[PDB]
Design a protein around this ligand. Structure first.
Ligand SMILES: [Cl-]
Length: 377
């Protein structure tokens, strides 16, 4: 059973050339027998027509498809774990974020439109840097001229990483006070206690400039939102989460510092995250917490949820590390059923609870069997 399409089907021979030449490429990884791929097929067909009218130039937007049953080598090459999967490429480079939005013609076309727009904000006067929103990260390029090899590298990097960080540009007499060294790039971390970080590589070198900028864009503890929730679950690690009100920035700072202090050993075993408690009231209900109880630290193993004792305890050395260790050892699961493990210097005896710890809430944000063919479980 195959459904006809006018979109280019990739195989082992043509894939590298087609992906490398396309400034932007949207690639549908599908299987004939996936009912969700089947429903997406006509929508993907019409979206490519809408986009090719808006973007008809030689290589500016290219829709393509991969039959993952016939080309299992290609599917594994791009770590396809579900159908349908919509990957975005840029000059052959696979973007971290997949399209996970609504499956409609308008939504797909809008995504391309948004991706093709200019993400860099041009500053008009250097006093805008003083008024800069320091809740976010910011990367600022000071250039002599927009028509330069230096800017074209910056432009390319910004196109890749705009969803991760705000990119700002300054030109001419506006930027000349900051260009005694020539063109330069500056990273401004969140908060007013962190000093600037300057890029000392060659701004004509894409690989090096991208690598330095990308390194600044990825926080140690990422914020989980509805937008990135699926992607975060696909990293296959349990969640260690700080639930906090958006305004209370000191709990986050405290949390990030202790993760950096104690949990570097746990880099590839548990995912460090923080979450706006008012947007995540329903997950908090799984553990019977409300924004009133925040800051709240919890683990979600994608089978159960466990609560950290008290946020203050994160100051006590070793406690946070121990909380992670107790997950992997099954101690957290045991202490729910039987109370805290007695020791000789600290036990009255708690009631036994035969029923299970709270169910996972972030499993609900993982790629769903109700809209994908899932390959992993
Ligand atoms: Cl567990």
């Amino acid at each position: 059973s195959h459904m006809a399409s006018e979109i280019t089907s990739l195989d082992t021979e043509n894939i590298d050339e087609i992906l490398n030449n396309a400034d932007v490429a949207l690639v549908n990884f599908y299987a004939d027998w996936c009912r969700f791929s089947q429903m997406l097929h006509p929508i993907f067909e019409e979206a490519s027509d809408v986009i090719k009218e808006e973007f008809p130039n030689e290589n500016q937007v290219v829709f393509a498809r991969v039959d993952c049953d016939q080309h299992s080598d290609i599917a594994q090459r791009y770590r396809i774990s579900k159908y349908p999967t919509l990957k975005l490429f840029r000059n052959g480079m696979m973007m971290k974020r997949e399209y996970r939005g609504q499956r409609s013609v308008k939504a797909l076309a809008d995504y391309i439109r948004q991706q093709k727009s200019d993400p860099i904000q041009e500053i008009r006067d250097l006093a805008e840097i003083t008024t800069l929103d320091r809740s976010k990260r910011n990367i600022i390029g000071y250039f002599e001229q927009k028509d330069s090899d230096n800017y074209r590298v910056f432009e390319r990097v910004a196109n890749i990483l705009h969803d991760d960080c705000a990119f700002l540009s300054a030109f001419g007499d506006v930027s000349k006070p900051e260009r005694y060294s020539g063109d330069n790039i500056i990273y401004k971390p969140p908060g007013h206690s962190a000093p600037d970080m300057v890029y000392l590589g060659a701004m004509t070198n894409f690989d090096v400039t991208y690598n330095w900028i990308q390194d600044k864009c990825v926080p140690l503890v990422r914020e989980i939102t509805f937008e990135n929730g699926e992607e975060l679950t696909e990293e296959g690690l349990p969640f260690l989460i700080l639930f906090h009100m958006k305004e209370d920035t000191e709990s986050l700072e405290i949390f990030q510092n202790e993760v950096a202090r104690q949990l570097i050993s746990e880099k590839g075993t548990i995912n460090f995250l923080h979450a706006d408690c008012d947007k995540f009231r329903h997950p908090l209900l799984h553990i019977q917490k409300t924004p009133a109880d925040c800051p709240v630290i919890a683990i979600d193993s994608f089978r159960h949820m466990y609560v950290f004792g008290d946020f203050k305890d994160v100051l006590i050395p070793g406690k946070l590390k121990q909380f992670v260790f107790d997950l992997h050892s099954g101690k957290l699961h045991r202490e729910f059923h039987h109370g805290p493990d007695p020791t000789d210097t600290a036990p009255e005896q708690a009631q036994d609870v035969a029923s299970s710890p709270p169910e996972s809430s972030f499993q609900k944000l993982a790629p769903s069997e109700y809209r994908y063919t899932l390959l992993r479980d």
